[PDB]
Amino acid sequence: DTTPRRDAEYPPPELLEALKPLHDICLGKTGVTEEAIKKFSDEEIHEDEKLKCYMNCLFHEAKVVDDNGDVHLEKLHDSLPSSMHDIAMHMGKRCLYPEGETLCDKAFWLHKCWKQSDPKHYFLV
Amino acid sequence: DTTPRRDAEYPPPELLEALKPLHDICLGKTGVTEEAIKKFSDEEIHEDEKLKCYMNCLFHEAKVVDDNGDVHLEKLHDSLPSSMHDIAMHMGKRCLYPEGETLCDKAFWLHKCWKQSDPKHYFLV
Numbered sequence: 665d666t667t668p669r670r671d672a673e674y675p676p677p678e679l680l681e682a683l684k685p686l687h688d689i690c691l692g693k694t695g696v697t698e699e700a701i702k703k704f705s706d707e708e709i710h711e712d713e714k715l716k717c718y719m720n721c722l723f724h725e726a727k728v729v730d731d732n733g734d735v736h737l738e739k740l741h742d743s744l745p746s747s748m749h750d751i752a753m754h755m756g757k758r759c760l761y762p763e764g765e766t767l768c769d770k771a772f773w774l775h776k777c778w779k780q781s782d783p784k785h786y787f788l789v
Numbered sequence: 790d791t792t793p794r795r796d797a798e799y800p801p802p803e804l805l806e807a808l809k810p811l812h813d814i815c816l817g818k819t820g821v822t823e824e825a826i827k828k829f830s831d832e833e834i835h836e837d838e839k840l841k842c843y844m845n846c847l848f849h850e851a852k853v854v855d856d857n858g859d860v861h862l863e864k865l866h867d868s869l870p871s872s873m874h875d876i877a878m879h880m881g882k883r884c885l886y887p888e889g890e891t892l893c894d895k896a897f898w899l900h901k902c903w904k905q906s907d908p909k910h911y912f913l914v
């Protein structure tokens with residue numbers, strides 16, 4: 665099943681809460697719309713350059729990046745609730761090696777790869 | 790459970806069979822001993838420089854490397870039987886980013902990291 669799962673247990677409320685201030689920071693900086701975030705989360709994969717940089721910004725603000733600003737998938741995994749560790753692993757197992765010229769391109773590459781892999785459990789806020 | 794699992798079912802016999810010709814090639818190329826391989830597989834981590842290159846050679850001969858000879862973990866995962874997929878996932882989840890000067894160093898880094906992560910299922914032939 666590919667329908668996004670959105671209920672009281674998933675996405676983990678603690679992760680949603682933790683992401684709220686990072687959302688404020690990154691939406692402020694990039695000027696992405698809330699609509700574009702919601703559509704990417706719950707509807708079709710779509711192209712929006714500010715959204716790509718919004719995705720990069722969340723990784724940077726969450727401190728899940730290396731010295732070059734590239735996503736460090738282990739740091740990212742560590743930062744997620746343990747309840748979603750297995751789902752996350754499977755979502756990212758064919759998404760190890762982002763491609764793209766810029767950090768925004770590579771961040772978007774990751775989100776798109778995850779959403780293609782597990783659209784039910786992929787989300788973005 | 791940290792003791793190496795060695796029985797008629799695991800390691801998968803079909804994988805051991807497929808590895809045999811690669812072992813012959815790579816031992817010839819690198820000068821590692823049969824004993825050094827068995828010791829690393831079943832006994833303790835140890836740092837034999839020819840073993841490290843043997844490890845690198847298997848990745849090359851198995852065609853699970855990128856254009857620069859670095860291990861491509863997705864390619865590697867796809868080369869393993871389904872029966873090992875989950876074991877390999879967990880074994881590698883904190884071994885994503887090898888460290889080392891040479892390709893032999895990085896290959897050893899991976900094997901050591903896998904063996905530290907799951908010495909029950911880690912093996913080398």
Ligand SMILES: CCN(CC)C(=O)c1cccc(C)c1
Binds near residue numbers: 753756778883
């Ligand atoms: C270490 C986990 N992993 C390797 C398979 C990942 O790609 C991974 C890490 C964090 C978050 C997501 C969605 C995937």
Ligand SMILES: CCN(CC)C(=O)c1cccc(C)c1
Binds near residue numbers: 863880881884
């Ligand atoms: C894609 C699987 N993976 C990411 C978690 C790995 O590190 C991985 C891949 C192949 C073989 C082993 C032992 C680990």
Ligand SMILES: [Cl-]
Binds near residue numbers: 707708709
């Ligand atoms: Cl889509």
Ligand SMILES: [Cl-]
Binds near residue numbers: 757874875878
């Ligand atoms: Cl798998």
Ligand SMILES: [Mg+2]
Binds near residue numbers: 825835837
């Ligand atoms: Mg020795």
Ligand SMILES: [Mg+2]
Binds near residue numbers: 891
């Ligand atoms: Mg050296």
